[PDB]
């Protein structure tokens, strides 16, 4: 049909209109952030229509809008896979991006080049919608690398400080360590299947796709940050908070797990891939959760929350239940956006200070922000009817109703408890205790570019999971016949984590000199994984790159072997040759020697 395709293409066209007008002379004479915000709003309103059509008929179109080039039986062409996942992610991303745009018009004033910030956000969203709607894999890689660079540029927004740049280069490094596996998979599918489109890769379903799936594992490990490549995500907080909320908690951090969701029919048959996904995701969900404990910066706490819930989603892909992982994507979006925007309100209200030890009594001095933040934290936990239930309940139900691995189950349960714990930690140290902030109070929660976006995300975080779950078509069959201590295990364990954190954060109010531990620093520091690896691995790399590469091969030994040997040989032959003295006696003696050699050669050869 025309309506469906027309709307899909019109979304991208609307999103490109701001980038067009930015390269014009019309950024002046208008208000560019409002124009962009309105473009995102109209794009969302248009994207609703494909969503309703799909919920009605469930058709999963496929478009090939433009042919690019043929390469000996390989038609590279722009083509979109407009399935369930694409539409449901497009709508959600546009919602969150509209809200983040209003916020980033409130926040980020005091910046003259705010329009550059807005343009970069639009470009990230465009690369994300390319990555998310793709049918090929070259197009998907375009969006992949686009997300990567956009994160480099937005993390490194304030290009004066030499920590944002380190964060950006770090992100780039880990994303490339993922892109190795991406390119490995792309190479394998090109060589064997002679194509990059999913419609052919689906015919590899019984073909021992081990190493391409390992490549996709590495790719999503790097992008949707997991343990082996985890550090870049909390380090991607030196950038502004709307950057964090939009990219590093909803979209760039979900690219790779979306990719694994899009390759689920190949994983049904490989069990080793499932097993390693399970163990790796569980490791992340434990590690980042216990590391969020004993953190003072809010932004890092939300980063580790993202990593933990993302490990839970990779745990879900560890079994044949990817659609539930995608529901958790679409629901996690609202929580993280709201949390980061409440954090940014709390921050920009007072000075740039982001640490809960100087935040104080926010239930009373900011009722709106506290209300929304508590709603978001409760929904992040498995609260029974706020869009965290409608995934997480089914998640834990599935994982304690499956026969895979017991340590993964156990540490995921502990990690859910820890989710309750650090949510309670924020709610205590930020929202309940007495004021620790400085005494000049300059709070202003009243701005319609602030309250309306978090209000929209709150209606989201209360209603959208209900709506989605009761509108989507049924897939990924659920199991529900089981004892009571498995249907209420997430609720129980979240409540119990809340209780423990309440008690333990009350324990600090009394007077007793607490001490450091071998624990509490493996959490405060990140298992010392940064503090070791980031200063040995580059050390040996760079030392081996100067010596043993430049000043050992190229500058001494390749000069001593090939050119300088030649020079010394020819000049030494010159010296022993042409250092003659002007005496005809010796010349004529040599002439006689030549006479003798010529006659001897004649007598011999003959």
């Amino acid at each position: 049909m025309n309506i469906f395709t027309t709307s899909i293409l019109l979304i991208f066209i609307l999103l490109l209109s701001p980038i067009l007008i930015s390269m014009s002379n019309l950024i002046k004479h208008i208000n560019f952030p409002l124009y962009t915000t309105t473009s995102i709003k109209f794009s969302f309103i248009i994207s609703l229509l494909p969503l309703l059509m799909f919920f009605h008929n469930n058709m999963e179109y496929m478009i090939t809008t433009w042919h690019w080039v043929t390469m000996n039986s390989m038609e590279l062409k722009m083509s979109f896979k407009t399935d369930f996942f694409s539409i449901l992610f497009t709508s959600v991303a546009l919602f969150v991006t509209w809200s983040i745009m209003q916020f980033s018009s409130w926040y980020m004033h005091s910046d003259p080049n705010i329009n550059r910030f807005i343009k970069y956000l639009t470009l990230f969203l465009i690369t994300m919608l390319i990555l998310t709607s793709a049918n090929n894999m070259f197009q998907l890689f375009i969006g992949w690398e686009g997300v990567g660079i956009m994160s480099f540029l937005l993390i490194g927004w304030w290009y004066g400080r030499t920590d944002a740049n380190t964060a950006a280069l770090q992100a780039i490094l880990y994303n490339r360590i993922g892109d190795i596996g991406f390119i490995l998979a792309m190479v394998w599918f090109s060589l064997n299947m002679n194509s990059w489109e999913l419609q052919q890769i689906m015919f590899s379903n019984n073909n021992d796709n081990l190493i391409p799936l390992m490549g996709l594992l590495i790719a999503a490990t790097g992008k949707s940050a997991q343990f082996g490549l985890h550090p870049w995500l909390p380090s991607a907080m030196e950038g502004p908070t709307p950057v964090s909320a939009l990219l590093h908690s909803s979209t760039m951090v979900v690219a790779g797990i979306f990719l694994l969701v899009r390759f689920h029919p190949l994983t049904t048959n490989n069990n080793f891939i499932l097993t390693t996904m399970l163990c790796l995701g569980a490791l992340t969900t434990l590690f980042t959760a216990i590391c969020a404990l004993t953190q003072n910066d809010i932004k890092k706490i939300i980063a580790f929350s993202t990593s933990s819930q993302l490990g839970l989603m990779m745990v879900t892909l560890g079994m044949n239940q990817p659609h539930l992982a995608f529901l958790h994507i679409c629901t996690h979006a609202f929580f993280k956006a709201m949390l980061f925007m409440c954090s940014g309100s709390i921050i920009h209200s007072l000075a740039d200070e982001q640490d809960i030890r100087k935040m104080g009594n926010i239930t009373k001095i900011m009722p709106f922000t506290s209300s929304c933040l508590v709603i978001g934290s409760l929904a992040l936990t498995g609260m029974p009817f706020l869009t965290g239930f409608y995934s997480k309940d089914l998640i834990i139900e599935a994982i304690n109703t499956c026969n895979t691995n017991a340590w993964a189950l156990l540490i995921t349960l502990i990690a859910t408890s820890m989710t309750a714990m650090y949510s309670m930690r924020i709610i205590y140290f930020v929202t309940m205790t007495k004021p620790r902030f400085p005494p000049l109070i300059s709070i202003n929660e009243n701005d319609p570019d602030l309250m309306n976006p978090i209000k929209r995300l709150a209606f989201g975080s209360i209603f959208a999971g209900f709506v989605i779950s009761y509108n989507i078509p049924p897939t990924s069959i659920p199991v529900l016949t089981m004892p009571w201590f498995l249907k209420t295990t997430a609720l129980i364990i979240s409540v119990l984590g809340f209780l423990i954190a309440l008690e333990l954060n009350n324990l600090t109010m009394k007077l007793s000199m607490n001490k450091a531990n071998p624990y509490s620093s493996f959490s405060t520091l990140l298992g010392f994984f940064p503090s070791i690896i980031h200063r040995i691995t580059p050390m040996k790399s760079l030392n081996l790159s100067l010596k043993t590469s430049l000043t050992l091969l190229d500058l001494i030994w390749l000069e001593k072997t090939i050119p300088k040997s030649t020079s010394t040989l020819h000049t030494n032959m010159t010296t022993l040759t042409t250092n003659q003295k002007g005496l005809i006696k010796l010349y004529f003696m040599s002439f006689l020697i030549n006479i003798i050699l010529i006659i001897i050669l004649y007598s011999i050869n003959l």
Partner: protein
């Protein structure tokens, strides 16, 4: 400027060949070379063997 000159042009004048220079250079030049030689050689030999035996799974390899 002194730094750049010490790290660009003042190298070979002060380079004196010694043990732990010559052996180190021979290793770091010709070792990875030989390692990757035998890796790729084993792979290609195994591949052409399994081809000429008339076995290899190349069910869709078209573009190569």
């Amino acid at each position: 400027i002194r730094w750049t000159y010490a790290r660009s042009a003042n190298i070979y004048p002060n380079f004196r060949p010694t043990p732990k220079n010559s052996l180190l250079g021979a290793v770091a030049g010709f070792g990875p070379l030989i390692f990757w030689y035998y890796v790729f050689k084993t792979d290609r030999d195994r591949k052409e063997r399994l081809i000429q035996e008339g076995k290899l799974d190349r069910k869709f390899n078209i573009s190569y």
